């Protein structure tokens, strides 16, 4: 809640996986190690699809604090998140059941 200002670069159209890959930059002065949940919320409002059409991971922060860089994903539809994503990230995001064995 300090004007999060999520910046995106390296946007390449990838229609053969029906997606757009881009590096998420998280500036956070006076705020430390925000989330994985709020990030998927706040970058889906510049692409305007849905929260579960947004995958994100990575995020080793800057030393000292005030900057965080990860790796972000956006798809064209909800069913594409069920096909093109890894099986544990959907459990992590909440979109699936992890059949433990």
């Amino acid at each position: 809640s300090d004007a999060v200002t999520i910046r995106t670069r390296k946007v390449i159209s990838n229609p053969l996986l029906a997606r757009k890959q881009f590096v998420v930059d998280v500036l956070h002065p006076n705020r430390a190690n925000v989330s994985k949940d709020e990030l998927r919320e706040k970058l889906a409002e510049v692409y305007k699809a849905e929260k579960d059409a947004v995958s994100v991971f990575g995020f080793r922060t800057q030393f000292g604090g005030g900057k965080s860089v990860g790796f972000g994903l956006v798809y064209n539809s909800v069913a594409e998140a069920k096909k093109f994503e890894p099986t544990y990230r959907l459990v992590r995001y909440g979109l699936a059941e992890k059949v433990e064995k």
């Binding site: 990838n14 229609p15 053969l16 996986l17 096909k83 093109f84 890894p86």
Partner: protein, 237 residues
Amino acid sequence: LKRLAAPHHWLLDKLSGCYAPRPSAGPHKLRESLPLIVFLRNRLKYALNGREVKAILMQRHVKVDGKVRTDTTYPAGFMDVITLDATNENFRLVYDVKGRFAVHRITDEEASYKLGKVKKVQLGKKGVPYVVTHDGRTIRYPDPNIKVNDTVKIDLASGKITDFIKFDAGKLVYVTGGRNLGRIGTIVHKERHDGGFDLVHIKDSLDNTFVTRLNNVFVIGEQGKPYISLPKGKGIK
């Protein structure tokens, strides 16, 4: 295949794993071909994992020379047309000036043929002759002028011959192996060498000469005026 045992023309670095994708059995050799998994995520980079390859393979995006080949490690070799129907892309597999496979986005009807040097000519069953190209393809009923060391423009909608170019001095060559891989210059002259190892001398448009074996000399047209759109660098090196 293991790592540091993969060939140099795949451009894979020493880290990221222990094994390499071994090229499967197929129409091309293991040493001068590049597998499909190496093609899309390591050259075109549009996938990231090995699991992401098989998802693209089972969506029928891709086809090699008009045929899908949805194996992971299929050995796509030289003059092969990899076709991405989604996003409308066509590709031709050609070497660099350093020996490595290059990405050359080609047009819609240049992707409707290839060039095949015939390896051998024998008289088949029931009286019909046949040619055998370098890319594992056979063509029966040939034009009787066509013999060994001749390239063939191939129809690619059927298995029929559309054009043939005879191995002559002053016809646009391309090196397909050895230390001089990727050079042009149409012929200087020939050496006989009774006993094999036949040396064909080539001098480029930048007037310099080199020596290769008859194994490696692959003509693609007449002087100047190629029969395929060449990449930048122009094989002059």
